[PDB]
Amino acid sequence: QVPDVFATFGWERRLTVIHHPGVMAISKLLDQRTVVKPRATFNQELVEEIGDYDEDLQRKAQVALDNGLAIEWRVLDFIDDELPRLLAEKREIEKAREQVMSKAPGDYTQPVFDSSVVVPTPANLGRNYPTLNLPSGDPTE
Amino acid sequence: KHFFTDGANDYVTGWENTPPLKFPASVMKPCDYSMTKPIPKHWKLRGSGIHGPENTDLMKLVLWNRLKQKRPQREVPNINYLKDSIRLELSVNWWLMSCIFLWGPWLHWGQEYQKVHEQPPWAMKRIDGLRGEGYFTWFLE
Amino acid sequence: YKTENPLYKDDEPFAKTCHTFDYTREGTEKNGLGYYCLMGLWASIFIWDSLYTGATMPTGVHRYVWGPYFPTAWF
Amino acid sequence: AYNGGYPFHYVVQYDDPNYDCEADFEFEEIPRDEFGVPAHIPPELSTQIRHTYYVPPQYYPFLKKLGEDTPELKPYTDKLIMGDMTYDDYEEMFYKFAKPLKIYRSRLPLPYRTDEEISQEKYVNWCGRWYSYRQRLQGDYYSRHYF
Amino acid sequence: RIGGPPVFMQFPPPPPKEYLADGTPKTYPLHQPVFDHGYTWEHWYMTNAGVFHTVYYGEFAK
Amino acid sequence: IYEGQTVQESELIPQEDDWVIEETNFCLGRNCYVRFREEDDLARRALHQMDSQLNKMHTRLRDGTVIPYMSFHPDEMVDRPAPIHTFSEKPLLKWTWDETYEEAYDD
Amino acid sequence: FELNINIINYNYLGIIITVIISIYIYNNSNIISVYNSNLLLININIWMKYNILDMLNLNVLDYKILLWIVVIIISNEILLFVSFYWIYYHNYINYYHVNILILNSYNIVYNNIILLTLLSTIVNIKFYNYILSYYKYILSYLIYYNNYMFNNKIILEYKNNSNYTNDSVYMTSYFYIILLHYIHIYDSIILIVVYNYVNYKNINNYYININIYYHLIEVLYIVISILLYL
Amino acid sequence: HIPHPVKYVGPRRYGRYVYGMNRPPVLRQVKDWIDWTGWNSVFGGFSFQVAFGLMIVSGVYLNNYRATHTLYY
Amino acid sequence: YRHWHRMSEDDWALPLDSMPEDVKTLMATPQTERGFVEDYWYNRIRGEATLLDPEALPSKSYIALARDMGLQIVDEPSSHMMGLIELYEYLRGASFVGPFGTIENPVLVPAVGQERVVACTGGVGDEEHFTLWFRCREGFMYRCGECDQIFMLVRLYYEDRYWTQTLVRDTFMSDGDMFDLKTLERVHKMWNKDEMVRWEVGYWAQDYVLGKGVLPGMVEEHTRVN
Ligand SMILES: CCCCCCCCCCCCCCCCCC(=O)OC[C@H](COP(=O)([O-])OCC(O)COP(=O)([O-])OC[C@@H](COC(=O)CCCCCCCCCCCCCCCCC)OC(=O)CCCCCCCCCCCCCCCCC)OC(=O)CCCCCCCCCCCCCCCCC
Ligand SMILES: CCCCCCCCCCCCCCCCCC(=O)OC[C@H](COP(=O)([O-])OCC(O)COP(=O)([O-])OC[C@@H](COC(=O)CCCCCCCCCCCCCCCCC)OC(=O)CCCCCCCCCCCCCCCCC)OC(=O)CCCCCCCCCCCCCCCCC
Ligand SMILES: CCCCCCCCCCCCCCCCCC(=O)OC[C@H](COP(=O)([O-])OCC(O)COP(=O)([O-])OC[C@@H](COC(=O)CCCCCCCCCCCCCCCCC)OC(=O)CCCCCCCCCCCCCCCCC)OC(=O)CCCCCCCCCCCCCCCCC
Ligand SMILES: CCCCCCCC/C=C/CCCCCCCC(=O)OC[C@H](COP(=O)(O)OCCN)OC(=O)CCCCCCC/C=C/CCCCCCCC
Ligand SMILES: CCCCCCCC/C=C/CCCCCCCC(=O)OC[C@H](COP(=O)(O)OCCN)OC(=O)CCCCCCC/C=C/CCCCCCCC
Ligand SMILES: CCCCCCCC/C=C/CCCCCCCC(=O)OC[C@H](COP(=O)(O)OCCN)OC(=O)CCCCCCC/C=C/CCCCCCCC
Ligand SMILES: CCCCCCCCCCCCCCCC(=O)OC[C@H](COP(=O)(O)O)OC(=O)CCCCCCCCCCCCCCC
Ligand SMILES: [Zn+2]
Numbered sequence A: 001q002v003p004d005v006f007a008t009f010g011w012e013r014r015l016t017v018i019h020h021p022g023v024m025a026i027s028k029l030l031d032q033r034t035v036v037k038p039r040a041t042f043n044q045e046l047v048e049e050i051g052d053y054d055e056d057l058q059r060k061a062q063v064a065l066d067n068g069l070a071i072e073w074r075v076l077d078f079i080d081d082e083l084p085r086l087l088a089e090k091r092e093i094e095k096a097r098e099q100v101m102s103k104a105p106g107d108y109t110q111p112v113f114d115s116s117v118v119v120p121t122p123a124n125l126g127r128n129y130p131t132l133n134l135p136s137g138d139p140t141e
Numbered sequence B: 001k002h003f004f005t006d007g008a009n010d011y012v013t014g015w016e017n018t019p020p021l022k023f024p025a026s027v028m029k030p031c032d033y034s035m036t037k038p039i040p041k042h043w044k045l046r047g048s049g050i051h052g053p054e055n056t057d058l059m060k061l062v063l064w065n066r067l068k069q070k071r072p073q074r075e076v077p078n079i080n081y082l083k084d085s086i087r088l089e090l091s092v093n094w095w096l097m098s099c100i101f102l103w104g105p106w107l108h109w110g111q112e113y114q115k116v117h118e119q120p121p122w123a124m125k126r127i128d129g130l131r132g133e134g135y136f137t138w139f140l141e
Numbered sequence C: 001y002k003t004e005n006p007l008y009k010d011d012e013p014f015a016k017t018c019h020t021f022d023y024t025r026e027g028t029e030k031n032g033l034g035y036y037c038l039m040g041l042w043a044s045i046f047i048w049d050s051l052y053t054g055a056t057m058p059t060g061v062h063r064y065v066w067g068p069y070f071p072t073a074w075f
Numbered sequence D: 001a002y003n004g005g006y007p008f009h010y011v012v013q014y015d016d017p018n019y020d021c022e023a024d025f026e027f028e029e030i031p032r033d034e035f036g037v038p039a040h041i042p043p044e045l046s047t048q049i050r051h052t053y054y055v056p057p058q059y060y061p062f063l064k065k066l067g068e069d070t071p072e073l074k075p076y077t078d079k080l081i082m083g084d085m086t087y088d089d090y091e092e093m094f095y096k097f098a099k100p101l102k103i104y105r106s107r108l109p110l111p112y113r114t115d116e117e118i119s120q121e122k123y124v125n126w127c128g129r130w131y132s133y134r135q136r137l138q139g140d141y142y143s144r145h146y147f
Numbered sequence E: 001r002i003g004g005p006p007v008f009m010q011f012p013p014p015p016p017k018e019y020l021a022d023g024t025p026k027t028y029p030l031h032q033p034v035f036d037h038g039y040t041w042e043h044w045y046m047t048n049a050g051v052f053h054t055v056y057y058g059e060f061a062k
Numbered sequence F: 001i002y003e004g005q006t007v008q009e010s011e012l013i014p015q016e017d018d019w020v021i022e023e024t025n026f027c028l029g030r031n032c033y034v035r036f037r038e039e040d041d042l043a044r045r046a047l048h049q050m051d052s053q054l055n056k057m058h059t060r061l062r063d064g065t066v067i068p069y070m071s072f073h074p075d076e077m078v079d080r081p082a083p084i085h086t087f088s089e090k091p092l093l094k095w096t097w098d099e100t101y102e103e104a105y106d107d
Numbered sequence G: 001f002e003l004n005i006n007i008i009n010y011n012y013l014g015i016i017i018t019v020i021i022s023i024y025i026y027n028n029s030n031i032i033s034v035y036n037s038n039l040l041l042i043n044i045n046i047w048m049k050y051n052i053l054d055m056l057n058l059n060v061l062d063y064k065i066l067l068w069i070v071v072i073i074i075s076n077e078i079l080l081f082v083s084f085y086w087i088y089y090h091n092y093i094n095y096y097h098v099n100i101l102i103l104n105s106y107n108i109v110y111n112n113i114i115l116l117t118l119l120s121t122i123v124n125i126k127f128y129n130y131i132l133s134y135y136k137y138i139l140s141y142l143i144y145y146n147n148y149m150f151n152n153k154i155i156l157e158y159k160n161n162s163n164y165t166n167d168s169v170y171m172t173s174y175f176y177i178i179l180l181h182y183i184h185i186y187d188s189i190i191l192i193v194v195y196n197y198v199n200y201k202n203i204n205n206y207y208i209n210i211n212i213y214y215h216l217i218e219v220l221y222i223v224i225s226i227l228l229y230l
Numbered sequence H: 001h002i003p004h005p006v007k008y009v010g011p012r013r014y015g016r017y018v019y020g021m022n023r024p025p026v027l028r029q030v031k032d033w034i035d036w037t038g039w040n041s042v043f044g045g046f047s048f049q050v051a052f053g054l055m056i057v058s059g060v061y062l063n064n065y066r067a068t069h070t071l072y073y
Numbered sequence I: 001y002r003h004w005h006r007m008s009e010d011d012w013a014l015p016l017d018s019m020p021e022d023v024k025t026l027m028a029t030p031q032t033e034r035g036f037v038e039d040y041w042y043n044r045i046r047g048e049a050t051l052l053d054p055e056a057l058p059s060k061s062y063i064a065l066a067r068d069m070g071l072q073i074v075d076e077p078s079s080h081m082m083g084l085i086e087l088y089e090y091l092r093g094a095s096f097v098g099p100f101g102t103i104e105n106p107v108l109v110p111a112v113g114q115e116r117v118v119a120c121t122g123g124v125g126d127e128e129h130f131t132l133w134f135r136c137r138e139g140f141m142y143r144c145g146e147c148d149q150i151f152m153l154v155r156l157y158y159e160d161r162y163w164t165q166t167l168v169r170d171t172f173m174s175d176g177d178m179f180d181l182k183t184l185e186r187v188h189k190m191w192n193k194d195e196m197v198r199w200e201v202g203y204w205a206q207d208y209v210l211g212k213g214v215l216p217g218m219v220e221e222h223t224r225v226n
Helices: A021-030 A044-050 A055-066 A079-102 B056-067 B079-085 B087-117 C033-051 D057-069 D071-081 D087-096 D121-146 F042-050 G013-025 G030-057 G061-090 G107-132 G138-160 G169-192 G205-229 H026-037 H039-069 I036-051 I054-059 I062-069 I076-092 I165-172 I181-191 I200-209 I218-222
Strands: A005-009 A015-019 A037-041 D050-054 E042-048 E054-060 F027-031 F058-060 F066-068 F092-096 I096-098 I107-111 I115-122 I128-137 I150-155
Touching: A005 A021, A005 B056, A015 A021, A015 B056, A015 I076, A021 D057, A021 D071, A021 D087, A021 I036, A021 I062, A044 A055, A055 A079, A079 D057, A079 D071, B056 D087, B079 B087, B087 G107, B087 H039, C033 H039, D057 D071, D057 I054, D071 D087, F066 I128, G013 G030, G030 G061, G061 G169, G061 G205, G107 G138, G107 G205, G138 G169, G169 G205, H026 H039, I036 I054, I036 I062, I036 I181, I036 I200, I076 I107, I076 I165, I107 I115, I115 I150, I128 I150, I181 I200, I200 I218
Parallel strands: E054 F027, F092 I096, F092 I115, I107 I150
Antiparallel strands: A005 A015, A037 D050, E042 E054, F058 F066, I115 I128
């Protein structure tokens, strides 16, 4: 049985509605921007258009497309180094999805997978990526 | 558009009378209960019956109009909208071009002709002995 | 997957409700042929008045192949 | 469809942790969007790219439980588990399960009226109808007389 | 809006009543004089009191 | 044009043969200038004035319902004399229509 | 809950401003008038401060109320010019055959039209940036340069004109119509000197007001140019 | 307002600028730009000056040349 | 509602600088004793502590889950009060149109005070008459003298207070088991390690529990120039 809950929005001017408690839990979970992360999936046509604005991203985006990776943009800037982990991450996520989906109803046991390669997770919280927004070339050449 | 209108060009609050067409009717629909079938006599009025947030569609309209104000990315309009937004700006710019490249040349030509022939090239020459340039806009004579 | 560039998408339609906005039958969206005919007439009158100054003072001698009550005479 | 497509509020991210858009007057940093798209990728291109929410796999058992307890919610939870839920899919889920508040007339205290008075309701309605009947007829009578 | 000007507030109780030393209640200025003269007529007029009611308004000579 | 409410014949049939139109007096009473007490100070005279408002009066019918003081315009709805702040709560103009929605009912 | 409107109970600028107006009548020296005008400018600024502080009420109708007020003001400005055009054209039958030199139709009209068109383009770019939540520093200084040239040209024209206000009703109407336009150009300087970027953006009545007002001044000059120069 | 599609039918992207290589002729580029930003602004902006210029300069023939050759006295 | 202005930044979330510095007492304060800012952070700290512990969510009941996030379970009493609040708020800047009022179903006129001005416009079509204004006072079943429409005043009153969202929560929500600071620490170490802080509210909250400026980088975080 799922009880109904009051959901309120706004700080000084507050609007209240009835909502699903599970939906609200998902809503607040997706607000944890550091934990739940949006990831980008490319297609060949879009990758080509990227080159019109950033040649380096086009090459890195092509690598992600060729491996069918859903990748965060910040990670994409380091896809040259992160590729072996990203491929391992892709397999582990797929394994977890298969196990949970295939489990019988009422079976809420955690999936068995290698969390050390999945980011962000408690086992691996990610790397401190340095900013790449610095120039390397000499204007007079 | 420049001018603010509560009904259509309401950029101060962003209120919209109807939800986006993207949502399925099941998720959200315009607030229209004009077609409601007759109420059975054995049904009893529990709520006020007053038009307001007790109706599901109006509640969802109010909720969406507040929660739409934060979005991850821009909702890109089509080029027709973008043209209309700066219609006056673009047209004034072309008017400036017309003044420089159309009006200027023939106005300069008329003054040079006037120097030699005492009257603009688009005017009948006088025989009455009066001196001076005379009229400029011939069709208003 | 396949996508459409938002810049070249079509305008969204007005919602169909009890209160539906409809400009389709108004004929106010753009200037029509009648407007451009008025412009053509204005150019013609402007040119004509300058070219033929005596048009406003026409001749009074009347000569009709089939008399004055024949249609071609009237025009 | 409001404010020309510009949201009133949106998230901006910076690569340098110590960056301040108000203190610094440098010209190399490029701000990112909520999904992480760098600013020099125009929205008409980035909006076409499909972004999906990825939750840590430890949340899958919980998302499964939500779907089973509420079957109407299952298709949205499945999309989230499979990494196929975009922002639009989340919005559809959010507004689909929003319900309006209920007012119960049975809980309203009533103005005090004695039992004897409550039995005279039909009589008072009867008097009101006769007043209207008399009113409407008199209008015709007076209109004829004075005009 | 939380913290905004309330749409309704109850009146605070009136200040304490004042009595003279002997106990007589203190009176305050009142511009409703009792004119002195021998006339005692009382005129009454049926007055509109809305759309469905009237009031019998009386004017007293005093 | 307005010509009163429409009436059906069945609505005029009485439930008793002795029914006649109720003779309730709609004259609110005898009034004059509001007469204050010399003992009342400024605050208590204000209370006195607030208790003499004709627009707060009504006539109770035989079924317990009351027909209040009514006016064509809202100028007669504020306290007399007009207070500094009149319509703290927005007056409601009640419109009627035949539209209804299912959420309001329960089976 | 809260009241729909946060009432304003007391105000004292009205007395000060009204007294400042009276000082103009009761002056015994034109120097007092100059300093009195500064007081009027100061107190009007305070009134504008109150309007900005009213934003704290978060009232949706405040923007609409001020916008429609400006529309009414714009109409009054148009009708004021209409009266001058009315005055000019009433004596039309007495023009063009009196021994006075009317203005040339080649030099003044063209450069002024070009100059004022640039002013419109600058303001249009300001509006576009305001739409895009963006700013360009140089734009304001282009307006000042534009206004500097306009002042320099008009000053020379009046000084070098060989006919005077008392020569004919034609000359009076020419000078007066041109001055009335200048005063409205100067009023634009008064407004534009404070242009800045405010982070509450499209709920700021100043931006829409400036765009409307600058457009009005420029269109009025087109009517003036057709009436007098062409 | 009548909803209607975007009439622009020219190329949507020329590709990344690489020292101005593999780009259309200049005149074609000007035509594409006006198509992209709308011909309605061009016609509206130029309409007033074209009308005034034609009327004034037409007098060279209508008012000056014709009058000299057409004066019955 | 249409008469509200744009959402503020605070309408979405509050800045961490508004977090009470005495977190230990904040998590022990009863709900009736928590202010708006204190209540906001109590729910966010406790709500995010449960949501950021995936392994425990599936075994947690909806009642417990709703309590942790600070969401109120709906019941007929609370639903009734909230519904009338929203109706009152909506009518502040919206028209008042509904079914014709009768003795069985009087027109409901919400009010905070004992009185509210109302107008009767009769029925639909020909039955509509000119506006008849009257003062709707509590405790009387009002009957329009022209159309015989029945009106009644509904007061949003409760125990010397008028109905508000916070009042409804305090009256009906019941505080559960006292929040355990061990859960805060346990979740803190889960998502915050070796200079990576993916659970920042807990990082600040844990720092306040340990005093202030104990965890790495928090002294630099709390030092301000103006
Ligand atoms: C021959 C060559 C030479 C030619 C020279 C020409 C000289 C012209 C001089 C003009 C001077 C400048 C004036 C305008 C300055 C601002 C320009 C500007 O910003 O334009 C772009 C901009 C475009 O707006 P947008 O929203 O981006 O539109 C996008 C699209 O265009 C699409 O927009 P949309 O169609 O979707 O609609 C949205 C927009 C559309 O509106 C506009 O865009 C307006 C554009 C107007 C441009 C000017 C054209 C000329 C107008 C002539 C009007 C004549 C009136 C009748 C006179 C009768 C005389 C006997 O609506 C608004 O903005 C609403 C504005 C408020 C209107 C208030 C009107 C009040 C008066 C009503 C009539 C009163 C009389 C009633 C009589 C009957 C009684 C029973 O315009 C505005 O936003 C301006 C609005 C604010 C200023 C309004 C001023 C109103 C003055 C009323 C005077 C009433 C006097 C009545 C008594 C008179 C007799 C005694
Ligand atoms: C065998 C013998 C053979 C003989 C052969 C002879 C051959 C003869 C050939 C004759 C040819 C005649 C052709 C006639 C047919 C014409 C068909 C046609 O196309 O008509 C339509 C055509 C264009 O109309 P349309 O189709 O509606 O326009 C389309 C638009 O795109 C509509 O789109 P939209 O509405 O979106 O347009 C943009 C609109 C969008 O609107 C908005 O964005 C919304 C806001 C609008 C309201 C704006 C409020 C104010 C704005 C403030 C900003 C101002 C900035 C400037 C400030 C200046 C400061 C100084 O915004 C604007 O347009 C306005 C803003 C732009 C700047 C405005 C500048 C000021 C304008 C007012 C003053 C004008 C006078 C200036 C005078 C000079 C300076 C003093 O009309 C004309 O061109 C007029 C007809 C002219 C006929 C002249 C006839 C006489 C001359 C004959 C010459 C040849 C004779 C030679 C001798 C021959 C002897 C034999
Ligand atoms: C080998 C060198 C050859 C040089 C050839 C000459 C080139 C001179 C170009 C001058 C263009 C001035 C345009 C003024 C309008 C406002 C421009 C603007 O928006 O600036 C924004 C710009 C940055 O604004 P922002 O807000 O930071 O950024 C806004 C945007 O986001 C970002 O803005 P943005 O970056 O997109 O800005 C684009 C552009 C937008 O404007 C344009 O692109 C317009 C271009 C128009 C070309 C005009 C050429 C005039 C030449 C006439 C010569 C006639 C000779 C006659 C001989 C007669 C013989 C008998 O603005 C500029 O680039 C403005 C000029 C920047 C220079 C600032 C440093 C001081 C002046 C240095 C002058 C050096 C001259 C060297 C000459 C050497 C010759 C061998 O503003 C400034 O830099 C600050 C104010 C200063 C700018 C104006 C400086 C005027 C200098 C005039 C020099 C020519 C004098 C000729 C006298 C002839 C007497 C007979
Ligand atoms: C194989 C076929 C090739 C055909 C090539 C055809 C080439 C035709 C070139 C025509 C050039 C005409 C130039 C006219 C410039 C006049 C400039 C002028 O008068 O400047 C002065 C004036 C300001 O002077 P004031 O003293 O202030 O007086 C007026 C206000 N009081 O300034 C202006 O007019 C500025 C505007 C400049 C206009 C420039 C026009 C250029 C036209 C080029 C046309 C090219 C056509 C090419 C066709 C190619 C076909 C294959
Ligand atoms: C003699 C002819 C006339 C000249 C003499 C002086 C006349 C003075 C009359 C001035 C009338 C002013 C009416 C203003 C109405 C519109 C107000 C308005 O919208 O202001 C707000 C608007 C936007 O504010 P927000 O906070 O974003 O939003 C507001 C709330 N939503 O702000 C502004 O308009 C900013 C204005 C800044 C410039 C102020 C300059 C004041 C100039 C006064 C001139 C006095 C000169 C006196 C000379 C006397 C001797 C000749
Ligand atoms: C196509 C674009 C242009 C459209 C122009 C529209 C013009 C509209 C005019 C409206 C007012 C009409 C008034 C009736 C016409 C009277 C004309 C007339 O008699 O003129 C002479 C007469 C003087 O003669 P007497 O007094 O007998 O002796 C004088 C001896 N010194 O003059 C007048 O009285 C006329 C003065 C009024 C006309 C000028 C001012 C009013 C017009 C303002 C126009 C404003 C801009 C356009 C607004 C409309 C825009 C859509
Ligand atoms: C207050 C003062 C205002 C200023 C003064 C205005 C006065 C005039 C105002 C008129 C209305 C202006 C707007 C018109 C809009 C328009 O064009 O409107 C265009 C409409 C057609 O509409 P659509 O094409 O949009 O459907 O045209 C018409 O309805 C009439 C004009 C068409 C041509 C008429 C032909 C006339 C014939 C005359 C005889 C010629 C003889 C030739 C012999 C060889
Ligand atoms: Zn009634």
